[PDB]
Design a protein around this ligand. Structure first.
Ligand SMILES: C[C@H](CCC(=O)NCCS(=O)(=O)O)[C@H]1CC[C@H]2[C@@H]3[C@H](O)C[C@@H]4C[C@H](O)CC[C@]4(C)[C@H]3C[C@H](O)[C@]12C
Length: 1189
């Protein structure tokens, strides 16, 4: 439901929410209830004006004035009784500035009570929710985490509770205002004008639709639009991910052709936002003005013939229906944010109440003492909750006698530690209970059983605080006198002193991490500090370095003894001196004997050891966009001068109820109400054209800015694609967002400084040409009224982003306590990681109690400054009409021209994608748009005409990675060769041999050591020739998302794409049958959805790709990287057949690749050592001579 969002409401918060919604009702009645004053005011003027104008002439009243000039002072001589000084303006406007500025205190002390009493009363519940959700994540099973992610529960803790801090906080408080000035807006019409506020409310739906889908559509056309781009969003991050290969063949000029074409699906999905949000602010201003035509014309029928309405009753019951139906369509952007909250909190409310299978809590269980540790395995069967079909364990029958070690030898991965996770109960066995010295492990205290065991994981993980209190996390009672004994035993004793400081070191996660074989020496001390009765080590030496490998084995083999240890073996020569080895092949322990017990048999480990123990620019860049920023701007003056002109038509009609002669009004009031229709054919025609041509010009820029962007982003070097500041994660999510913040510097910004420049300076003509004296008073409020329309938005969105940097501190303690949940629940308790959330969840509560009372006073004072502006004015306005000759009609004109052109300064002013975040957003693009790269395809392109003939040479080539400074100098190397021959590098696997031939591809550059072609200076040979006459194949497979032929099509970049080698390269590269063994011929889509062919299958495309070409140098850079013993073998024929015209460098990392091709030059430092052939490495050391050694 919806009133389930308030489920966590306490009693101090259901009372801080009633008086914050009594004073929200009682605010919303002000704005259509202030027209009651304004409608008995434009009538008290107009009776003063009628008598004063009739006082002027001595016409029909020949021998007299009416009662004026001593007829009400004589002996009862009042022939009419009314025309006197009996209406005094002095004594009357002091009585309508009392009222009009007594609302502006009780709309100031109840607009800081409707918004400082809800945003307290929401952020006092989301503290109680977010704290309570996390208390019952940490009690779920382990297997519940195995089917719910950790990077997804970290979004449903911060980005999905903050979607129900909008359906409670102010969008409830700002809705029981905007739906009680509709119930009190329209119904305050039917109180008076029941036959006139029906001929207006019969057009009130057709404004109530249009005011809705202005505010609602901007919050709807974001994700409606953000996904129409992303068809381009893969073609960008395909190539930028696969950048080596597209630049391997030179196919760059036809790789903006897949990004010139495929961009138009958002080139016309953002035009279409310009109409639909620009036409609809015309179709409220075509409907207000035409409603004024139908209210004034039809209303002037009644007010003149019946007399049943008075002229102040007539401007009061349609200015209560306009502001009565503005809010009803301005509460719909506030009722979208309930159905967003109500439908995105059903995940949280389903996690709070599942009541898990195993608590990891204390009370509900059974307690046992003096534990021997008779560990038992009765006949289990066991699925995962992730993969529920595979049977990991089957009828597993084995015992563990207490006091000694016990091994576990699986083949590779059958029951390695899944058998062992049950003894600490991360999973219940579905059949076959297991028992511990009598009583079983189910129906016992989880917080007692998890005290006795002690786990040592595969990979170490350490928590963020001090290493002397990280070991404290097991056995909470222990002190520094007792901590120090375990770090002694677990080899941290020299790591006391070599460490920067003695036992306070934060940098276990904080400053700088230790080595992978070193954190484990902490984790042994963590499990040993608790005085455990069970040790459980599951591949402690799984993946760590060979030095401390043998060092931590000394911790376990030589030192560790005394009680029950259930262990496994990474290598079993360590456990060769132990008690029992109960290894198995599948789910059932078979052997249970020592190594001499399986000398006589085969079993599970004797079988194993037979084979293992052997600013001006943005305009000038948009210079072809001149007709769509001048007919877009002529259409932005002529509806910027509509608001100021309206103040002159509306205040014209209001003086024309005062003229005495009856035929003149019905002629005159029918004249001015005809002008409102003509301002309904204009201010829709030019509110269309101010939202169309400023959104073709903001979309014919950002289409041509992307295509120029991706011609330069493609045509640069590899040396910064691998750079840290711009990786392909950020080099394609820049190009989506930053290309859209660059329309807001040219297109829709000249529709602001000429919208709100003709809006203001035609208002100051009207405001000063009629009475300058009354326009000094009100213009003293022109700063406080325009600038207050856009100072809460710049406050608020700069004050959600100070919550985020107060809540990212919470997103630390979460993510270090869900990503490693198997180590939290295994060691002691998670009480510590619950209790360290309440202490960190006060801190985003103190910056949402300071979004109460600085979003009170920027919202109360943003709303009583236009009710005090109508009180300093008309107080002084009454001073003018009485003793000066400023007649009545000019006071509604001076005031409606500098309030309507003050709000529509700011209201227009917040339609700006901010100019400061475009110039700092365009400047991060022009440097890309004109960068000078060190080597380039778009450079001097005429140094060629050398037929290669395989005389390619090295002379002592040094090399660096300038983007990854691991070393500083790779050693020089000098190799020359003859055509049709092989260099055949084998040697250093780390930056030694593949890198020294990926250098030969012009991807990186020689640090020194000039290479040659035919005595040529290779940097003075252009890349378009040189990169054409070669051909590579990648180590790892990476192709496109196209079909089979479309990558063999891709084998040339400029040349005539062959169909005659489609037949030949299929049979030359071993795939002429595999292209036929598929059910289809060409439609085998290789990346998108069709076939997830294996690495041995997928490479067979790639050898076929370059073999269509006619190159001089082959680059067989580490193929046959698959262990698939026939797919590895079959592809070897492809590398061996492609010869005879190929000056190759085929590496032969393994023995199966050919060794008798030619010489070997490289070695461990990248030095030309042992230059001779295969038959010369027998005297000295060799690679084959090392693997036999
Ligand atoms: C006079 C109306 C409400 C009065 C008001 O603002 N109340 C508080 C101060 S006081 O009581 O007028 O003293 C205002 C409120 C909203 C206004 C409308 C909105 O601003 C929308 C457009 C704006 C255009 O510039 C003019 C037509 C118009 C359709 C406006 C006509 C008129 O000025 C309205 C209907």
């Amino acid at each position: 439901g919806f009133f389930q969002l308030f489920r966590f409401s306490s009693s101090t918060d259901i009372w801080l929410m009633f008086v914050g919604s009594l004073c929200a009702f009682l605010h919303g009645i002000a704005q259509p209830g202030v027209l009651l004053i304004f409608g008995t005011m434009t009538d008290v003027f107009i009776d003063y004006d009628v008598e004063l104008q009739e006082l002027q002439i001595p016409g029909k009243a020949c021998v007299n004035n009416t009662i004026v000039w001593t007829n009400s002072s004589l002996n009862q001589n009042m022939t009419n009784g009314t025309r006197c000084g009996l209406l005094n303006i002095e004594s009357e406007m002091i009585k309508f500035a009392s009222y009009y500025a007594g609302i502006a205190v009780a709309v100031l002390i109840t607009g800081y009570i409707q918004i400082c009493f809800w945003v307290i009363a929401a952020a006092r519940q989301i503290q109680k929710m977010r704290k309570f959700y996390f208390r019952r994540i940490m009690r779920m099973e382990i297997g519940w985490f195995d089917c719910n992610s950790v990077g997804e529960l970290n979004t449903r803790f911060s980005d999905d509770i903050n979607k129900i801090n909008d359906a409670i906080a102010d969008q409830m408080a700002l809705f029981i205002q905007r739906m009680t000035s509709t119930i009190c807006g329209f119904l305050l019409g039917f109180f008076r004008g029941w036959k006139l506020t029906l001929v207006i409310i019969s057009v009130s739906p057709l404004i109530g639709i249009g005011a809705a889908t202005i505010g609602l559509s901007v919050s709807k056309f974001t994700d409606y639009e953000l996904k129409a781009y992303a068809k381009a969003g893969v073609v960008a991050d395909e190539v930028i991910s696969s950048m080596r290969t597209v630049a391997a063949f030179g196919g760059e000029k036809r790789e903006v052709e897949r990004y010139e074409k495929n961009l138009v699906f958002a080139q016309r999905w953002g035009i279409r936002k310009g109409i639909v949000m620009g036409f609809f602010t015309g179709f409220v201003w075509c409907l207000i003005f035409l409603c004024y035509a139908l209210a004034f014309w039809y209303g002037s029928t009644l007010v003149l013939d019946e007399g049943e309405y008075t002229p102040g009753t007539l401007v009061q019951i349609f200015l209560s229906v306009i502001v009565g139906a503005l809010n009803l369509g301005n509460a719909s952007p506030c009722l979208e944010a309930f159905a967003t909250g109500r439908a995105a909190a059903t995940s949280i409310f389903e996690t709070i109440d599942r009541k898990p299978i195993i608590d990891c809590m204390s009370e509900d269980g059974y307690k046992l003492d003096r534990i021997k540790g008779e560990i038992e395995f009765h006949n289990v069967t066991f699925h995962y909750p992730s993969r529920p079909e595979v049977k990991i364990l089957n009828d597993l029958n084995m015992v563990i006698k207490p006091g000694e070690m016990t091994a576990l030898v699986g083949p590779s991965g059958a029951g390695k530690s899944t058998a062992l996770q049950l003894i600490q109960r991360f999973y219940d066995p579905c059949e076959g209970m297991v028992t511990v010295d009598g009583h079983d492990i189910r129906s016992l205290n989880i917080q007692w059983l998890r005290d006795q065991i002690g786990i040592v994981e595969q990979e170490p993980v350490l928590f963020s605080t001090t290493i002397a209190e990280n070991i404290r996390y097991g056995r909470e009672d222990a002190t520094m006198e007792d901590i120090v004994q375990a770090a002694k035993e677990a080899n941290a004793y020299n790591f006391i002193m070599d460490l920067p400081q003695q036992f306070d070191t934060l940098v276990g996660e904080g400053g700088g991490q230790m080595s992978g074989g070193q954190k484990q020496r902490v984790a042994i001390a963590r499990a040993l500090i608790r005085n455990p009765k069970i040790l459980l080590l599951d591949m402690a030496t799984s993946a760590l370095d060979n030095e401390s490998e043998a060092m931590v084995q000394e911790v376990l083999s030589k030192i560790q003894h005394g009680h029950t240890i259930i262990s496994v073996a990474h290598r079993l020569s360590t456990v060769r001196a132990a008690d029992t080895i109960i290894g198995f092949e599948h789910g059932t322990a078979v052997e249970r004997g020592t190594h001499e017990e399986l000398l006589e048999r085969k079993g599970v480990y004797f079988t194993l050891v037979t084979l293992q123990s052997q600013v001006r620019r943005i305009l000038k860049f948009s210079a072809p966009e001149w007709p769509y920023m001048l007919v877009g701007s002529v259409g932005a003056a002529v509806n910027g001068t509509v608001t100021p002109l309206y103040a002159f038509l509306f205040s014209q009609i209001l003086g024309t109820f005062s003229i005495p002669d009856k035929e003149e009004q019905r002629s005159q009031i029918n004249g001015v109400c005809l002008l409102f229709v003509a301002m309904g054919c204009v201010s829709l025609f030019t509110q269309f054209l101010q939202g169309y041509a400023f959104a073709k010009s903001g979309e014919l820029l950002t289409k041509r800015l992307r295509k120029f962007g991706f011609r330069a982003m493609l045509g640069q070097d590899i040396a910064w694609f691998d750079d840290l500041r711009n990786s392909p994660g950020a080099l394609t999510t820049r190009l989506a967002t930053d290309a859209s913040q660059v329309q807001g510097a040219a297109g829709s910004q000249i529709g602001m400084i000429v919208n709100s420049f003709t809006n203001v300076t035609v208002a100051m003509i009207i405001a000063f040409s009629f009475s300058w004296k009354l326009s000094l008073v009100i213009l003293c409020f022109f700063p406080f009224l325009a600038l207050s329309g856009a100072t809460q938005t710049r406050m608020l969105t700069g004050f959600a982003s100070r919550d985020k940097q107060a809540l990212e501190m919470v997103g630390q303690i979460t993510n270090e306590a869900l990503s490693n949940i198997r180590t939290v629940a295994g060691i002691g308790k998670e009480r510590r990681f619950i209790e360290a959330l309440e202490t960190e969840l006060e801190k985003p509560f103190k910056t949402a109690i300071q979004k109460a009372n600085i979003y009170g006073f920027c919202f109360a004072f943003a709303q009583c400054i236009m009710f005090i502006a109508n009180s300093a004015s008309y107080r002084y306005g009454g001073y003018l009409i009485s003793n000066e000759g400023l007649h009545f009609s000019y006071v509604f004109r001076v005031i409606s021209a500098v309030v309507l052109s003050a709000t529509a300064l700011g209201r227009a002013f917040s339609y700006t994608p901010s100019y400061a975040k475009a110039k700092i957003s365009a400047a991060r693009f022009f440097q890309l748009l004109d960068r000078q790269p060190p080597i380039s395809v778009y450079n001097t392109a005429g140094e060629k005409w050398d037929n290669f003939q395989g005389k390619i040479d090295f002379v002592d080539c040094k090399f660096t990675y300038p983007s990854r400074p691991d070393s500083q100098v790779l050693n020089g190397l000098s190799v020359s060769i003859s055509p049709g021959q092989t260099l055949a590098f084998v040697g250093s696997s780390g930056c030694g041999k593949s890198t020294s031939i990926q250098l030969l591809e012009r991807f990186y550059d020689p640090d020194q050591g000039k290479v040659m072609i035919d005595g040529h200076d290779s940097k003075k040979v252009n890349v378009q020739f040189l990169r054409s006459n070669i051909g590579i194949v990648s180590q790892e497979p990476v192709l496109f998302a196209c079909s089979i032929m479309d990558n063999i099509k891709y084998g040339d970049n400029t040349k005539e794409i062959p169909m005659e080698r489609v037949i030949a390269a299929a049979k030359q590269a071993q795939l002429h049958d595999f292209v036929m063994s598929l059910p289809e011929k060409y439609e085998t889509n290789v990346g998108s959805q069709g076939s997830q062919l294996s690495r041995g299958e997928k490479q067979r495309i790639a050898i076929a790709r370059a073999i269509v070409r006619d190159p001089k140098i082959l680059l067989l850079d580490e193929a046959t990287s698959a262990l698939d013993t026939e797919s590895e073998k079959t592809v070897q024929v492809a590398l061996d057949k492609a010869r005879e015209g190929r000056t190759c460098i085929v590496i032969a990392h393994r023995l199966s690749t050919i060794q008798n091709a030619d010489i070997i030059a490289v070695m461990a430092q990248g030095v030309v050592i042992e230059k001779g052939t295969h038959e010369e490495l027998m005297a000295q050391k060799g690679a084959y001579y090392k693997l036999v050694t």
